[PDB]
Enzyme design. Structure first.
Site, PDB file in Angstrom:
ATOM      1  N   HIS B  44       1.026  -1.286  -0.010  1.00 39.89           N
ATOM      2  CA  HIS B  44      -0.023   0.105   0.035  1.00 39.89           C
ATOM      3  C   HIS B  44       0.735   1.391  -0.099  1.00 39.89           C
ATOM      4  O   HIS B  44       0.421   2.373  -0.382  1.00 39.89           O
ATOM      5  CB  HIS B  44      -1.008  -0.169   1.089  1.00 39.89           C
ATOM      6  N   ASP B  91      -0.584  -7.320   1.601  1.00 38.59           N
ATOM      7  CA  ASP B  91       0.103  -5.992   1.607  1.00 38.59           C
ATOM      8  C   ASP B  91       1.487  -6.028   2.016  1.00 38.59           C
ATOM      9  O   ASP B  91       1.993  -5.890   3.107  1.00 38.59           O
ATOM     10  CB  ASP B  91      -0.669  -5.309   2.723  1.00 38.59           C
ATOM     11  N   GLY B 192       2.592   6.626   8.665  1.00 35.85           N
ATOM     12  CA  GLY B 192       4.018   6.846   8.474  1.00 35.85           C
ATOM     13  C   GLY B 192       4.865   5.761   8.891  1.00 35.85           C
ATOM     14  O   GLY B 192       6.023   5.525   8.340  1.00 35.85           O
ATOM     15  N   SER B 194       3.980   2.562   8.375  1.00 33.27           N
ATOM     16  CA  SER B 194       3.434   1.668   7.271  1.00 33.27           C
ATOM     17  C   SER B 194       4.447   1.079   6.606  1.00 33.27           C
ATOM     18  O   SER B 194       5.431   1.800   6.301  1.00 33.27           O
ATOM     19  CB  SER B 194       2.352   2.040   6.374  1.00 33.27           C
ATOM     20  N   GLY B 195       4.854  -0.180   6.326  1.00 31.74           N
ATOM     21  CA  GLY B 195       6.030  -0.869   5.749  1.00 31.74           C
ATOM     22  C   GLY B 195       6.917  -1.368   6.417  1.00 31.74           C
ATOM     23  O   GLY B 195       7.798  -2.184   6.124  1.00 31.74           O
TER      24      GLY B 195
HETATM   25  N1  LIG Z   1      -2.829   1.315  14.231  1.00 30.76           N
HETATM   26  C1  LIG Z   1      -2.110   0.720  13.180  1.00 30.76           C
HETATM   27  C2  LIG Z   1      -1.856   1.308  11.925  1.00 30.76           C
HETATM   28  C3  LIG Z   1      -0.613   1.550  11.259  1.00 30.76           C
HETATM   29  C4  LIG Z   1      -0.193   2.281  10.196  1.00 30.76           C
HETATM   30  C5  LIG Z   1      -1.382   2.722   9.263  1.00 30.76           C
HETATM   31  C6  LIG Z   1      -2.593   2.733   9.934  1.00 30.76           C
HETATM   32  C7  LIG Z   1      -3.780   3.396   9.451  1.00 30.76           C
HETATM   33  C8  LIG Z   1      -4.602   2.290   8.371  1.00 30.76           C
HETATM   34  C9  LIG Z   1      -5.868   2.949   7.926  1.00 30.76           C
HETATM   35  N2  LIG Z   1      -6.616   3.624   8.868  1.00 30.76           N
HETATM   36  C10 LIG Z   1      -7.917   3.542   9.198  1.00 30.76           C
HETATM   37  O1  LIG Z   1      -8.549   4.217  10.108  1.00 30.76           O
HETATM   38  C11 LIG Z   1      -8.659   2.498   8.561  1.00 30.76           C
HETATM   39  C12 LIG Z   1      -8.789   2.077   7.407  1.00 30.76           C
HETATM   40  C13 LIG Z   1      -9.588   0.964   7.273  1.00 30.76           C
HETATM   41  C14 LIG Z   1     -10.124   0.957   8.692  1.00 30.76           C
HETATM   42  C15 LIG Z   1     -11.014  -0.027   9.271  1.00 30.76           C
HETATM   43  C16 LIG Z   1     -11.726  -0.616   9.880  1.00 30.76           C
HETATM   44  C17 LIG Z   1     -12.521  -1.495  10.695  1.00 30.76           C
HETATM   45  C18 LIG Z   1     -13.281  -1.423  11.881  1.00 30.76           C
HETATM   46  C19 LIG Z   1     -14.262  -2.248  12.437  1.00 30.76           C
HETATM   47  C20 LIG Z   1     -14.695  -3.366  11.582  1.00 30.76           C
HETATM   48  C21 LIG Z   1     -13.861  -3.702  10.413  1.00 30.76           C
HETATM   49  C22 LIG Z   1     -13.046  -2.774   9.778  1.00 30.76           C
HETATM   50  F1  LIG Z   1     -12.462  -3.124   8.460  1.00 30.76           F
HETATM   51  O2  LIG Z   1      -9.610   1.656   9.423  1.00 30.76           O
HETATM   52  C23 LIG Z   1      -5.898   4.940   9.416  1.00 30.76           C
HETATM   53  C24 LIG Z   1      -4.693   4.211  10.065  1.00 30.76           C
HETATM   54  C25 LIG Z   1      -2.825   2.108  11.332  1.00 30.76           C
END
Ligand SMILES: NCc1cccc(C2CCN(C(=O)c3ccc(C#Cc4ccccc4F)o3)CC2)c1
Ligand SMILES: NCc1cccc(C2CCN(C(=O)c3ccc(C#Cc4ccccc4F)o3)CC2)c1
Ligand SMILES: NCc1cccc(C2CCN(C(=O)c3ccc(C#Cc4ccccc4F)o3)CC2)c1
Ligand SMILES: NCc1cccc(C2CCN(C(=O)c3ccc(C#Cc4ccccc4F)o3)CC2)c1
Lengths: 242, 242, 242, 242
Positions: B44, B91, B192, B194-195
């Site tokens: 991603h 991913d 940030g 991520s990866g």
């Molecule tokens: N905390 C670890 C972490 C590390 C790197 C990047 C993120 C991002 C990933 C995308 N983000 C989101 O808020 C995001 C994208 C998709 C979902 C949902 C969900 C979800 C919640 C309840 C049930 C089922 C689901 F798919 O959340 C921002 C944080 C989070």
């Protein structure tokens, strides 16, 4: 809505606006009146997380958003149990209004399509809503309801287009069977149109082919608008709606 | 990185920073040196759309981002063909550096785990990177590399946690088998990071258990950090990496 | 407008909206109809830099901004020659409409005060506009015209209030004689109300005492709203307005 | 700093950074070390309102902002009593450090000019700081101290330039006698450079001609950078600084 124009007052009587409580009852998604007491929308507008029913209102057909608001409470939010992301699918939900609406010529239901319904490549279809006019370009005040005629793109053709300029293997399905494509680089739905209807005129009857779901941007090359295919969820809709 | 602290200079020699061309070579994702000529990251970060190789650089372990940059060009971006979204899975991606790196004590490879390695709860695991310190809270300048010890959560316990306060049916798997869960409300990876790597110390050896992939926000109740499970992609990694 | 309420349709017939060309004809300042062909506003709304006449329109009294627009072109922008910043003063300008307006009960001129009128504390005064409802808080859609009753503060007291919690020497005049003070921590004009009117009822006649000019924030302790004192510029206004 | 380049390590030993407490000690203005215990800056950086001494730190010469921070507390903030706005003038302030600094070759004081010192056009002058590189363009990380050689423009020519494309009467003085102008469309100070020094080499000695104060944008046609003229405030500076 990308391209197209402001809708005439007599058109799209089933169009609804979903409102979230805050400084004002702000539009966040569209929907469609499918029964006097039921609104059809996209699951991603109201989920996957459970939110407070008190923080939501439905607004029936409005020529200009916010101008003549008559906000309606919701007694139930029914989200398809398979839903978690629009890219996986099952991007569909139902809102039960606390009270049924008094149906008229200006405000009435849309017809759901029969189970067989196919929407052939290039049928006369229209997408409506108060969403963005382009990528990161808000619908300007006084916020008219917009419409745009969009060409249907067959699923296989559409899925191949999503693989152009992408790393995803050709054997990996991006446009699923429960999805439908429509639009091009000049005509599309955009952020804020989500949950709203894609209607096609079939044998003199307007049928809701799709629910605005997702896509890569708005009116981008090789990225048609992706819709939840209504026919795939007819049984689920009928379990709740008379 | 949510919680934890600034990493000592001698720790995490495999940590890399992915840079995008613009007003400056800005950090957008993490990565790990798994071979002198190969970087492991999240798909991603570099996909699903194909981007120009010239617009990407790799920065090896740096105490403070941007201060002592020695940017490295990439000859190949290999994204898992099953990838299109982090929520679906696959991913994972590989970056081939134009030239191999001169491996030392301060900058060297991380060990990939054996196929059998499961990483059960209680295992000492650390997540590292230059990502956000909380939701919508950037890592402040001088941008130190951060670390945080994160607790492992069994896939099934994590999947059940993701269903709490959600409409998603209990029979619908959110946390897939190709995923791994780590973190709580005080310790997590964030945008940030991520990866980047999730490393666990197993029999005196640091093994890369996961790749920072997704989650719902950062250190949110009932939403542990979701990682791509490295063991699931060992055959795919070995097709490209010696 | 901070505090107060939505104005009744029969109130403030002289209120105007100044519009700037862009994606839409956006409100940027208020004004008042002082003659069928003349609008009184603040110089800082249209200066100190000279802008294109074609990029400006005047909107007469509107209950809800943008909803029933009938935009008027301007033939002349006359900015007080002493003006460069609102803090120095002379924050007053005149707009000559290309055509005179057809004056009615719903849309008509405000009366300028005689040279002798001082507007002491205790005078019933109202400030009107479509400006922010608080510091960094925009007026929400459908953008109703708001009003607020504001208490007048005698000049020297308002000048001394501006010195409280400031380094500025007590002998250094902040609030000048060509300025007028009104409002408190609950009732004030705010960003977007600039150029609009402050009207006081004197012997059964509404007189324009001030032009919304500046202040430190909106409804902040010891920082009342600062207005251009209309009586100070009567000779200059009469050089252009019959 | 608009135009110019990254300053050599040996240049500008008097340059300081003013820091505000928040998520990190963020740079908000520059300054200059004029005595081992005194920092010269702009009044608008620290006023007109009185702020908490604890919320302020001074950072001495740094090649790259935030990299090797050793923040210094302040015991006194002395703002010129005539100050309220940079456009009016008296945009000058003094910061007394809790302790004197240990002066070296890399970090030492700037010389104030003699009262007779006029800095006419043709004089080699530089303005330094970590401010914006253009209008709404932040200095990118690792935040090097920048310098730009700027041409001095005589006050009356500069005053007349500020009247071009403005409504302000020619008889109204914009650029005051306590002000100094320098820069053009390729060379200028910008947001974040405020309070910092304008230095000119006179008879082999660097003299601080000005303090970065204001202007209309950065490097805009007919809008040179406006500086507080140091010579005008020597007596006031000498009341506090030995
Ligand atoms: N905390 C670890 C972490 C590390 C790197 C990047 C993120 C991002 C990933 C995308 N983000 C989101 O808020 C995001 C994208 C998709 C979902 C949902 C969900 C979800 C919640 C309840 C049930 C089922 C689901 F798919 O959340 C921002 C944080 C989070
Ligand atoms: N114009 C149709 C439409 C209607 C309503 C809302 C949107 C949003 C959906 C989410 N957005 C995205 O950019 C987004 C989220 C996920 C993807 C991918 C993709 C994709 C591209 C190439 C191959 C495979 C993919 F999954 O795009 C913003 C526009 C788009
Ligand atoms: N409530 C009145 C009102 C109406 C319309 C627009 C505004 C703006 C004017 C500019 N704003 C400011 O915060 C501002 C600009 C300049 C100053 C200082 C000051 C000051 C404070 C203490 C002593 C002397 C001063 F000049 O404040 C925001 C709101 C304020
Ligand atoms: N010279 C570069 C420079 C260096 C430091 C800080 C700034 C600020 C000062 C405030 N800014 C403004 O745009 C601003 C604030 C007030 C004015 C007017 C003016 C003016 C123009 C024509 C005639 C009379 C005037 F007072 O401009 C932004 C950058 C600009």
């Amino acid at each position: 809505i990308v391209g197209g124009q402001e809708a005439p007052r007599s058109k799209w009587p089933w169009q609804v606006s979903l409102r979230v409580h805050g400084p004002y009852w702000m539009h966040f998604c569209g929907g469609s009146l499918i029964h006097p007491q039921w609104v059809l929308t996209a699951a991603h507008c109201v989920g996957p997380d459970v939110k407070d029913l008190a923080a939501l209102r439905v607004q029936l057909r409005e020529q200009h958003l916010y101008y003549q608001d008559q906000l309606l409470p919701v007694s139930r939010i029914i989200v398809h149990p398979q839903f978690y992301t629009a890219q996986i699918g099952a991007d569909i939900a139902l809102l039960e209004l606390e009270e049924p609406v008094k149906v008229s010529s200006h405000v009435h239901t849309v017809t759901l399509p029969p189970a067989s319904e196919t929407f052939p490549p290039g049928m006369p279809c229209w997408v409506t809503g108060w969403g963005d006019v382009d990528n990161d370009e808000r619908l300007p005040p006084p916020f008219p309801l917009k419409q745009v005629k969009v060409p249907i793109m067959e699923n296989h053709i559409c899925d191949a287009k999503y693989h152009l300029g992408a790393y995803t293997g050709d054997d990996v399905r991006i446009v699923r069977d429960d999805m439908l494509c429509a639009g091009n680089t000049r005509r599309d739905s955009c952020q804020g149109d989500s949950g709203g209807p894609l209607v096609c005129k079939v044998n003199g009857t307007w049928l809701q082919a799709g629910v605005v779901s997702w896509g890569e941007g708005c009116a981008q090359p090789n990225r048609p608008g992706i819709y939840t295919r209504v026919t795939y969820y007819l049984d689920w809709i009928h379990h709740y709606v008379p």
